[PDB]
Protein: Thiol:disulfide interchange protein DsbA
Organism: Escherichia coli K-12
Amino acid sequence: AQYEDGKQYTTLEKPVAGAPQVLEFFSFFCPHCYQFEEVLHISDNVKKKLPEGVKMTKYHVNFMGGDLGKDLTQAWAVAMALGVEDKVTVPLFEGVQKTQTIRSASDIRDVFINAGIKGEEYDAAWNSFVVKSLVAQQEKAAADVQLRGVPAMFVNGKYQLNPQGMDTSNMDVFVQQYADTVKYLSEK
């Protein structure tokens, strides 16, 4: 076949009920994740190849970066709760990996302040039980697949994309193969 189980994707042994159509995991410490965001725009290119209105979800993980990694999962919960993912994603990647200015929870907060989230609103969200539940949801989704690596992409709670085999000589061809593979998996 052109797409083969065990090759371009893997079938999960335990389908995750109630999973969104597309579930991506990332870490702000993850070098490929930074590339997937700013240079490849993987999520937007996947979205464009899928039917309109399909549910796509993106969650942060704790397993990279120790204490700060877990602070970043809580900050990602804040970003989701406030709907400000598009305003903070690149500045968070830059602060962790490019300028290396994000060293503490206060430095994370500074990124949101600079992006225009009022401090009182950030602090209220950071301490909210809505955000605690979003933290729990991110941890539970990763635990459902014993996740050990990011970036990771899961389709319908049934298939994991495997990009390590795809050709990387041309960035746009890579993105097209990734998006077309997600579309194929979503149609299974």
In short: Residues 1-188 form one domain.
